[model samples]
Target: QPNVYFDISIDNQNAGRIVFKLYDDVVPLTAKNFRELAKNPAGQGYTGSTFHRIIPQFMLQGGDFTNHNGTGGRSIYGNKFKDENFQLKHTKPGLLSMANAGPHTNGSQFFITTVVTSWLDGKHVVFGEVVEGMDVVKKVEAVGTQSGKPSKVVKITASGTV
Candidate 1:
């Protein structure tokens, strides 16, 4: 089990580390792509990357890969990757998924698991699970949800495995 790190910073608070392992067996493509993006380039790579949407106790939406600055997160993967099937339930709090505008429209936007969102079963392409740091996810969701960036400034610093 390889370990990956996600350094989350809330506003002026010191950034905290959320370590977890990637489920390469379940969604290899999504896991690999995400890790690749988090390898280098620090802030430009993931800093200032916006969490565009919010649903209480559900998840924090991200991956709007469109703009060239890596701000626009897209999950298309050049049409090489497709949704993978697994028995994994969306029960875990940190499960990640490629967010699509509709079926076959997933091109980079994703959400962080917060609570049980079973109603979303078999709809979007779920590709990863959070082996740890779910509490941080909960703290993120608990922040003020004004539908934009949070004052706490929960930034994603890394997403790669060793």
Candidate 2:
């Protein structure tokens, strides 16, 4: 099969488009879970969500389409999914990985690295990479934030090829 990919549009516009390549082979369940939540054609997906949390030069996280707050949102399974096989290292910028409070807590939320973060290896499932728009990711990172929340709004929408 061809490589699966997706695009994340910030603020519901083309202001920034970050394309991510999903690793369905390495992290099947995690990838599938994300794809489902993102590709929900009934209009329920990450289409109208905010970044919610931002850590400059570290990562930008979103996908909380439900509460629009960092605390809400779940996987397609309606609960957490186990951390899948992860071979990618957080060795550079643009790495996409699952976000969780702890082990086996994979949910709808994910983060895109702004800089190398090797310490996160083995802790989060690195399921994708930013194939495009690293600058946009940086722009989002540059947005002023308060308590990890963006001072200005940054919304997102997800779509991908099968």
* All candidates: TM-score: 0.76, 0.86
Clashes of each: 12, 0
The models' CA-based lDDT, in order, is: 0.61, 0.76
lDDT of 1 at 65: 36
Residue 85's lDDT in candidate 2: 58
Residue 60's lDDT within candidate 2 is 91
Cα distance off (Å), candidate 2, residue 69: 1.2
lDDT of 1 by residue, 1-162 (tens): 466666776664545566656677877776666666555354434444545566566788765434522246544265335566544567767878766655565555667777777777777667676677777766677664665445455666445565
lDDT of 2 by residue, 70-114 (tens): 888889887688887558789889988889989988888998888
Worst 10 residues of 2 by lDDT: 1-10
Which residue pairs come into collision in candidate 2? none
